[PDB]
C-alpha cells in the first residue's frame, strides 16, 4: 500500500502514497509486466468531473467551502442538462498544468508550473486554428529564449466534430522515398508527407523541408498552411573542433511542439492541444540523427573521423555518437536557442522527484523513457527506482486521424 | 491469450503464448508498474505439485511425456516426499534444471548460450574445505587459460533451513574495499562490508586497490571459513588503451572470470542456496559500471583530466567522451590477452536473434528491458527498440538475503 523507492547511488529512500489515487490502468498484471510496451455518457462524466473539482478546490485550500459545493452543483446541473460542461479558465489552466505534472514519461517536469496556457476554445475554423498556432509558435520561440506553452482547442462533443492537428509535431521535416529505393529526408514522416502532397503541397523534395500544417476544425476535411519561415527558428549544426562537420549539411529546428495528443481534464477531451517546451540534446543527436530508421548518419560521420569501422569492438558507433551530440549542443548554445543536456536534465528531474515526494507524496515516473538513450548509467536517473502509474488530468495517445476521419 | 511485441526499428512483430505457463508474481498490478524496482522451510503441502510440474516439463523436453518412465518417476518422487519430506533430483534432471534457470533468466542478455553450460554436481559435499576444492576446480575449468567456458556448481539443497550451504562472497572473485579514516575508500566500494567481515574473521588485508578477496564458505549451516584462491588460478588483465599510452599509468586492472555466488537456484520446489555460476563479461559491465559508477571506482574525472577535456561544463559531454575511451580500453585489453569478452553491440544483436528463435521454438522469451539494455549507447543497440515481456518461469535463479544478516553463529 505505502511504497518505497530507493536511489542506489545515494541510498535516499522515498515513500510513495500518491499512487493510491491512481485511477487508470497500466497494462501490467501480477503475471506479466508490460513496462517496455510503447502503447498499451452522462453516467461516466459526473464522477470524472467531481474527482477533478475536488482536487482543484483542494489545491486552492477551499475543499469543502460553499464555492466548491456550488460549482459541484453548477457542473452537475450543466451535465444533466447539456450532457457536457465547460471549464472555467482557472480550472483549465490548472488542468493543463497538472496533465504535464502527471506525465510519467517526461524528464522535464521541474518546469511544470511555468506553462503558458492559450485558451482557444472559441476557435471555429482551420484558418482560426492556423492563427492561434502561429501565435503559439512565435510566443514559444521568443527569438531563441524558448518558453513552455499549450494551446487548447474546443473539447470533443459527439465525436463527429473533433478538432485535430494532423501533424505529429507542428514543425517537422519532410520524408520522401525515391526510385532509388532509399529515403530522402526524414523517414518517420514519409506517410504524412505523401498525405500533404496528396492534398496539393508542392514539395521542395529536400533533406530538410519544413512540412505544411494540416488542420481540422470541427470535424471538417483538413487544410494546408505554410508556417511563415520567419517563425521557424532553425539551427545549423557544426562541431566545436571538427571543421568538416558543417559540410555534412545538418540542421535542426529549435522548437519541439507535440500536436497529436489528447488532453483529458475532468472527463472532458481536448483532441487538439499542441504543446511545446524545448529540447534535451539527445532527442536530436542520438535519436533523430542516429536511429537506423531516421537520418541514420553514424556511418558517414565515422568515416569523416577516420575510425576503424571493421569491428564493432572499436566502439566507433559510440565514438561518433558522442561527437554528434557535442555538436548539437554546441550549435544550439552558440546560436542562443534554449537546449538542455542529458546530465543537467536528469540532475533536474531527480531534484523534482524529491520535491514531489515531499509536497505531493510521490511522482509517477517511467524509467524506460526517463533514462536517456546515451550514457544511461552515468546519469542519476539510472540508479533511481521509479513507480509508474496513471493519474488524471493527463495527456494520452490517440489514433492518427487519417485512419479514422471520413471525407 | 496471445500477446504481441513489436520491434520499432524493424517492424517485426512477435507473438507470446509462453507467459501462460507463468505462475510466480511480478510485483506489478493493473494500477502500478514496478518494473524498475531492483528487488520486488517448504512443506509437503506445497512441494508435490511443484515437483510434478517440473517433471512434466523435464519429460516433454525429452519426448517421453506420459511414458512409463515418466509415470514411475512421479510415483517414486511422491513417495519419497511424503516419507522423507523432500526429494533428490537425478543428474539429468539437475542439468536440465540449471540450464532452464539460465534460459528463464529474463535479466540476462547472454542467454543465447543457455544450452552450453557445464554442470558440476557438488551435492556429495559436506564441509567447507570440500567447498573450496569444488570451487577451485570450477574456476580452473571455466577460466581455461582465457578461453572462458560457462559453468555452474551445485552444492546440496536446503533441508530444514538450518543447514544451508552458502557462499558468503557475492562473486567468487572480487576486489576488497577499505573505508579509510578520512572517509575515502581504497579499492572497491561495493565490497567494503564484505571485506570487513572477512577481516573480522581473520583475513590479513593487503590493503591495496586490487586485492582478491578470500572465499568465505559455509557448509551445512556451520559457521563459515576463510580460504585463499590460488593466485595462479585468478586470471587478470592489465588495462591499457590502443592510442593513449598514459592509460596504463592509471594502474587499472580487472579479473576475467565473472562468477555469481549469491543467488538461490530453484528446481522443482527444491532450493539450492549455493550454486555459483560463471560465464564471461560484456565489456560495459567493467567499463561503464565497475569503473565509472560514482559509487564504484569512479575514474571518469581522472580519465577526462588526462584527456584534457573541457570539464567546466557538463555540456562538453566530457563524461561521455571519457566513458567511451575507457570502454575501448577494456575491450582492447581483454582481446590482446586472449581472454573472452563481448562488446555490447555484438551481445545485444545476438540476444535479439536468440529472442526471435525462442519466440518460434518456445512461444516466448521473458525479458527485462531495464536490465537488457546496456548502460551506454542504449538507443544504438537493437534491444532499445524491442518491446519485451517480463514474467517469471521456473526453474529460476532468485535473490536471497545476505547470509551475515540471517546466520546463527555457533562460535
Ligand atoms: C520544458 C522543457 C521540456 C523538456 C526538456 C521535456 C523533456 C521530455 C523528453 C525528453 C521526453 C521524451 C520524448 C521522446 O523520447 O520522444 C518528454 C516526454 C513528454 N513530455 Fe516533456 N519536456 C518538457 C516540457 C514538456 C511540456 C511543456 C509538456 C506538456 C505541457 C510535456 C509533456 C510530455 C509528455 C506527455 C511526454 C511523453 C509523450 C509520450 O508518452 O509519448 N513536456 N519530455
Ligand atoms: C556466457 C556469458 C554471459 C554473459 C555475457 C551474460 C551477460 C549478462 C549480463 C551483462 C547481465 C547483467 C549483469 C548486471 O547488470 O550486473 C546478466 C544477468 C544475468 N545472467 Fe547472464 N550472462 C552470461 C552467462 C550467464 C550464465 C552462465 C548464467 C547462469 C547460468 C547467467 C545468469 C544471469 C542472471 C541470473 C542474471 C541476472 C542477475 C540479477 O538479477 O542480479 N548468465 N547476464
Ligand atoms: N514508429 C514510431 N511510431 C510511434 C507510434 C506511437 C507512439 C510513438 C511515440 O513518439 C515519441 C517517440 N520518441 C515522440 O513523441 C514526441 C515527443 C513527445 C514529447 C516530448 C518530446 N520532446 C520534447 N522536448 C518536447 C516536445 C514538446 C514539449 S517538450 C517529443 C511513436 C516511432 C517512435 C520512435 C521511432 S519510430
Ligand atoms: N547496493 C547494490 N547492491 C545490489 C543489491 C541487490 C541486487 C543487486 C544486483 O546485482 C547486480 C548489479 N549489477 C550484480 O550482479 C552481478 C552479475 C550478475 C549476473 C551476471 C553478471 N555478469 C556476467 N557476465 C556473469 C556472471 C556470471 C555468469 S555471466 C554480473 C545489487 C547496488 C546496486 C546499484 C548500485 S549499488
Ligand atoms: C520498445 C521501447 O519501449 C521503446 O523503444 C522506447 C524505449 N525508451 C524510450 N524512451 C524515450 N524517451 N523515447 C522513446 O521513444 C523510447 N522508446
Ligand atoms: C533502479 C534500477 O532498476 C537499477 O539502477 C538497475 C537499472 N538497470 C540495470 N541493468 C543492469 N544490467 N544492471 C543493473 O545493475 C541495473 N540497475
Ligand atoms: Zn510492469
DSSP assignment of B295-338 equals: TTT--HHHHHHHHT---S-GGG-HHHHHHHHHHHHHHHHHHHTT
The domain covering A122-147+162-233+397-401 belongs, at the CATH homologous superfamily level, to Nitric Oxide Synthase;Heme Domain;Chain A domain 2 (3.90.440.10)
Q: What is the CATH number of domain B16-123+150-160+264-278+348-372?
A: 3.90.340.10
With beta carbons less than 8 A apart as the criterion, state whether B406 and B273 touch: no
Asked if residues A348 and A380 have their Cβ atoms less than 8 Å apart, the reply is: no
Whether residue B252 contacts residue B299, with contact meaning beta carbons closer than 8 Å, is answered with yes
Gap between the Cα atoms of A392 and A264, Å rounded:
7
| Residue matched to cell numbers 493493473 | B30
CB-CB contact of A186 with A295 (8 Å): yes
Q: Is the dihedral of CA B300, B306, B311, B317 positive or negative?
A: negative
Which residues pair with residue B342 across a beta bridge? Answer: B282
Whose grid coordinates read 535473490? B399
DSSP per-residue string spanning B143-202: HGGGS---EEEEPPPPSSSSS--EE-SSBSS-B-EEE-TTS-EEE-GGGHHHHHHHHHHT
Q: DSSP assignment, residue B18?
A: G
B362 and B230 Cβ atoms separated by less than 8 Å: no
Three-class secondary structure of residue B140 per DSSP = helix
Q: Which residues pair with A210 in a beta bridge?
A: A173
Map out the domains of chain B as residue ranges: 16-123+150-160+264-278+348-372, 124-149+164-235+399-403, 236-258+281-346
The closest residue, in CA terms, to atom 12 on ligand 1 is A106
- Tell me the CATH number of domain A16-121+148-158+262-276+346-370, given options 3.50.50.60, 3.40.630.10, 3.90.340.10, 3.40.30.10: 3.90.340.10
Distant-in-sequence, close-in-space partners of B296: CB < 8 Å, separation ≥ 6: B188, B189, B190, B289, B290
A177 conformational bin, left if phi > 0, alpha if psi -120 to 50, beta if neither:
beta
Order of strands across the sheet that contains A223-225: A164-165, A213-216, A223-225
Beta carbons within 8 Å of B110's beta carbon, 6+ residues apart: B279, B282, B342, B347, B350, B351
β B215-218/B166-167 pair status: antiparallel
Residue A261 alpha carbon, nearest atom of ligand 3? 18
Neighbours of A145 (CB within 10 A): 11
- Are β-strands A149-152 and A116-119 bridged in parallel, bridged antiparallel, or unpaired? parallel
Resolution in A: 2.1
Residue whose CA is closest, atom 14 of ligand 5?
A369
Which residues, 6+ apart, have CB-to-CB distance to B365 below 8 Å? Answer: B18, B111, B354, B355, B358, B359
CB contact under 8 A, B331 and A319: no
Residue B32, all three cell numbers: 502500478
Q: Are A385 and B5 a contacting pair at CB < 8 A?
A: no
CA distance A220 to A164: 9
Cell of B330: 577494456
Residue B36 marked in a binding site: yes
Alpha-carbon gap, residue B177 to B169, rounded angstroms: 13
Burial class (CB in 10 A: 0-12, 13-18, 19+), A21: middle
Helix (H, G, I), strand (E, B) or coil at B278: strand
Phi/psi for B169 (5° steps) reads -55, 150
Q: What is the DSSP letter of B65?
A: T
Instruction: Tell me which of B37, B109, B189, B260 to substitute to probe ligand 4's pocket, judged by most ligand atoms within 8 Å of the beta carbon.
Output: B260
B51-71 burial: b if 16+ Cβ within 10 Å, else e: beebbebbbeeeeeeeeeebe
Residue of chain B with shortest Cα separation from A289: B380
CA angle centred on B219, ends B216 and B224, rounded to 5°? 35
The span from the first CA to the last CA of chain A, in angstroms, equals 50
Cβ–Cβ under 8 Å, residues A195 and A403 = no
Beta-strand pair B3-6/B13-16: antiparallel
| Measured distance CA(A201)–CA(A210) in Å, rounded | 11
Catalytic annotation on A196?
A: no
Nearest by CB to residue B26, choosing from A9, A32, A386, is A32
Rounded CA-CA distance A78/A164 in Å is 26
Angle at Cα A75 formed by Cα A74 and Cα A78, nearest 5°? 90
Question: Cα A268–A166–A87 angle (5° rounding)?
Answer: 20
Flag if A321 and B25 touch (Cβ within 8 Å).
no
Residue B130 DSSP SS3: helix
Q: Is A242 annotated as a binding residue?
A: no
CA distance B42 to B51: 12
Give which of B153, B170, B138, B159 is closest to B220, Cα–Cα. B159
**B200 in the Ramachandran plot: left (φ > 0), alpha (ψ -120 to 50) or beta?**
alpha
For ligand 2, pick from B36, B40, B107, B398 the residue to mutate: most ligand atoms within 8 Å of CB: B107
In angstroms, the CA A266 to CA B82 distance is 60
Give the minimum alpha-carbon distance from A312 to chain B in angstroms, rounded to a whole number: 6
How many CB atoms neighbour CB B166 within 10 A? 25
Contacts of B323 in chain A (CB under 8 A): 375, 378
Q: Say whether A109 is catalytic.
A: yes
3-state secondary structure chain A: CCEEEEECCCCCEEEECHHHHCCECCCCCCCCECCCCCCCCHHHHHHHHHHHHHHHHHHCCCCCCHHHHHHHHHHHHHHHHHCCCCCCHHHHHHHHHHHHHCCCCCCCHHHCCCCEEEECCCCCCHHHHHHHHHHHHHHHHHHHCCCCEEEECCCCCCCCCCCEECCCECCCECEEECCCCCEEECHHHHHHHHHHHHHCCCCCCCCCCECCEEEECCCCCCEEECCCHHHCCEEECCCCCCHHHHHHCCEEECCCEECCCEEEECCEEECCCCEECCEECHHHHHHHHHCCCCCCCHHHHHHHHCCCCCCHHHCHHHHHHHHHHHHHHHHHHHCCCCEECHHHHHHHHHHHHHHHHHHCCCCECCHHHHCCCCCHHHCHHHHECCEECECCCEEECCCCHHHHCCC
Q: How many residues does chain A have?
A: 407
> Is B150 assigned a ligand-binding role in the annotation?
no
- Strand bridging mode A279-280 / A339-340: parallel
Residue B171 backbone phi and psi in degrees, to 5: -135, 155
CB A342 within 8 A of CB B287: no
CB-nearest partner of A377 from B288, B321, B345? B288
In DSSP terms, which residues pair with B179 in a beta bridge? B185
Spacing of C-alpha B345 from chain mean position = 20
B136 near B227, Cβ under 8 Å?
no
Q: Nearest residue CA, atom 13 of ligand 5? A: A369
How many Cβ atoms from other residues are within 10 Å of residue A369's Cβ? 16
Cβ neighbours around A83 below 10 Å, total: 12
CB atoms within 10 A of CB A243: 8
Helices (H), B90-127: 91-103
- Measure the CA–CA gap between B358 and B335, rounded to whole angstroms: 30
CB of B319 closer than 6 A to ligand 5?
Answer: no
Cα Rg for chain B, rounded, in angstroms? 23
Ligand 4 mean position to B233 CA, how many Å? 23
3-state SS record for B242-263: CCCHHHHHHCCEEECCCEECCC
Place of cell 592489465: B238
Going from the Cα of B68 to the center of ligand 2, the distance in angstroms, rounded, reads 37
End-to-end CA distance of chain B: 56
Comparing alpha-carbon positions, the chain A residue that sits nearest to B348 is A312
Cis bond before residue B395 (omega within 30° of 0): yes
Our measurement of the distance from residue A142's CA atom to the centroid of its chain's CA atoms, rounded to an integer in Å, reads 19
* Fold (topology level) of B124-149+164-235+399-403: Nitric Oxide Synthase;Heme Domain; Chain A, domain 2 (3.90.440)
Query: What architecture (CATH level 2) is domain B236-258+281-346?
Result: Alpha-Beta Complex (3.90)
Whole-angstrom Cα distance, residue A201 to residue B403?
Answer: 70
Q: Same fold for the domain at A122-147+162-233+397-401 and the one at A234-256+279-344?
A: no
> CB-CB: which of A31, A287, A385 is closest to B36?
A385
Give break positions in chain B: residue before each, C–N beyond 2.5 Å: 40
Q: How far is CA B69 from the centre of its chain?
A: 34
**How far A318 CA sits from the closest chain B CA (Å)?**
6
Instruction: Find the Cα–Cα–Cα–Cα dihedral A79, A81, A87, A88, rounded to 10°.
Output: -130
Cα B104 from Cα A365, distance rounded (Å):
28
C-alpha cell at A121: 476554445
**Which of the residues B15, B33, B295, B325 would you substitute to probe the A interface, choosing the one with the greatest number of A C-beta atoms within 10 Å?**
B33
Nearest CA in chain A to B300: A378
Q: How many whole angstroms separate alpha carbon A393 and alpha carbon A357?
A: 19
Cell of B54: 517440473
CB A338 within 8 A of CB A328: no
> Annotated active-site positions of B, please?
108, 111, 280, 285
B319 and A375 within 8 Å at the Cβ level: the answer is yes
CA-CA distance, B297 to B251, in Å (whole number)?
12
Rounded Cα distance between A136 and A153, Å, is 12
Q: CA of A293: which chain B residue's CA is closest?
A: B9
Q: In angstroms, rounded to a whole number, what is the distance separating the alpha carbons of residues A230 and A255?
A: 13
State the distance from the centre of ligand 5 to the C-alpha of B50, rounded, in angstroms.
Answer: 38
Contact B28 A30 (CB under 8 A): yes
Considering only CB atoms, B32 lies closest to which of A375, A378, A387, namely A387
Q: At what angle do helices B68-84 and B44-61 cross, to 10 degrees?
A: 160
Q: Could you tell me which residues are beta bridge partners of residue A262?
A: A396
Tell me which residue of A167, A1, A19, A2 sits closest to A104, measured CA to CA.
A19
Which residue lies with its CA nearest to atom 11 of ligand 1?
A: A106
In this structure, the residue with its CA closest to atom 16 of ligand 4 is: B260
Q: How many residues does chain B have?
A: 411
Q: How far is the CA of B25 from the centre of ligand 1 (A)?
A: 32
Nearest Cα of chain A lies from the Cα of B62 at a distance, in angstroms, of 28
Q: Is the peptide bond before B188 cis (omega within 30 degrees of 0)?
A: no
Closest CA to B34 of A386, A12, A384: A386
Q: Do residue B391 and residue A341 have CB atoms under 8 angstroms apart?
A: no
Nearest to B111 by CA among B388, B375, B394, B367: B367
DSSP for residue B285: I
Which-ligand-closest: CA of B148?
2
Residue nearest (by alpha carbon) to ligand 2 atom 29: B102
How many Å apart are CA A57 and CA A285, to the nearest integer? 43
Question: A234-256+279-344: what fold?
Answer: 3.90.1230
Are B370 and A367 in contact (CB < 8 Å)? yes
> Of B222, B224, B226, which Cα lies nearest the Cα of B162?
B222
Answer yes or no: is B384 a known binding residue.
yes
Interstrand relation of B215-218 and B225-227 (parallel, antiparallel or unpaired): antiparallel
Sheet holding B166-167, edge to edge: B166-167, B215-218, B225-227
CA distance A80 to B167: 69
Amino acid at each position: 500500500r505505502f511504497l518505497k523507492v530507493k536511489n542506489w547511488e545515494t541510498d535516499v529512500v522515498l515513500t510513495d502514497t500518491l499512487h493510491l489515487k491512481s485511477t487508470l490502468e497500466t497494462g501490467c498484471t501480477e503475471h506479466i509486466c508490460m513496462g517496455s510496451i510503447m502503447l498499451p455518457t452522462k453516467d461516466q462524466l459526473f464522477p470524472l468531473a467531481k474527482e477533478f473539482l475536488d482536487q482543484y478546490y483542494s489545491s486552492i485550500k477551499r475543499f469543502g467551502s460553499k464555492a466548491h459545493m456550488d460549482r459541484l452543483e453548477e457542473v452537475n446541473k450543466e451535465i444533466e442538462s447539456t450532457s457536457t460542461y465547460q471549464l472555467k479558465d482557472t480550472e483549465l489552466i490548472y488542468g493543463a498544468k497538472h496533465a504535464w505534472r502527471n506525465a510519467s514519461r517526461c524528464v522535464g517536469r521541474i518546469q511544470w508550473s511555468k506553462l503558458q496556457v492559450f485558451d482557444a476554445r472559441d476557435c471555429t475554423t482551420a484558418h482560426g486554428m492556423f492563427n492561434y498556432i502561429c501565435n503559439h509558435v512565435k510566443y514559444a520561440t521568443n527569438k531563441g529564449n524558448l518558453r513552455s506553452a499549450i494551446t487548447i482547442f474546443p473539447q470533443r462533443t459527439d465525436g463527429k466534430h473533433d478538432f485535430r492537428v494532423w501533424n505529429s509535431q507542428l514543425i517537422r521535416y519532410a520524408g520522401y522515398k525515391q526510385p532509388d529505393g532509399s529515403t530522402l529526408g526524414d523517414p518517420a514522416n514519409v506517410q504524412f508527407t505523401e498525405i500533404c502532397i496528396q492534398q496539393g503541397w508542392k514539395a521542395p523534395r529536400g533533406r530538410f523541408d519544413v512540412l505544411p500544417l494540416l488542420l481540422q476544425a470541427n470535424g471538417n476535411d483538413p487544410e494546408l498552411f505554410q508556417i511563415p519561415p520567419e517563425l521557424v527558428l532553425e539551427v545549423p549544426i557544426r562541431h566545436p573542433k571538427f571543421d568538416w562537420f558543417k559540410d555534412l549539411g545538418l540542421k535542426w529546428y529549435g522548437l519541439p511542439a507535440v500536436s497529436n495528443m489528447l488532453l483529458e481534464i475532468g472527463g472532458l477531451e481536448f483532441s487538439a492541444c499542441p504543446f511545446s517546451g524545448w529540447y534535451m540534446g539527445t532527442e536530436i543527436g542520438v535519436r533523430d540523427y542516429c536511429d537506423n530508421s531516421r537520418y541514420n548518419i553514424l556511418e558517414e560521420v565515422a568515416k569523416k573521423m577516420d575510425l576503424d569501422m571493421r569491428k564493432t569492438s572499436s566502439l566507433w558507433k559510440d565514438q561518433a555518437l558522442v561527437e554528434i551530440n557535442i555538436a548539437v549542443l554546441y550549435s544550439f548554445q552558440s546560436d542562443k536557442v534554449t537546449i538542455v543536456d542529458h546530465h543537467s536534465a536528469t540532475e533536474s528531474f531527480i531534484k523534482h522527484m524529491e520535491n514531489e515526494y515531499r509536497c505531493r507524496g510521490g511522482c509517477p515516473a517511467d524509467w524506460v523513457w526517463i533514462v536517456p538513450p546515451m550514457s544511461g548509467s552515468i546519469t542519476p536517473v539510472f540508479h533511481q527506482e521509479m513507480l509508474n502509474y496513471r493519474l488524471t488530468p493527463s495527456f494520452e495517445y490517440q489514433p492518427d486521424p487519417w485512419n479514422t476521419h471520413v471525407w
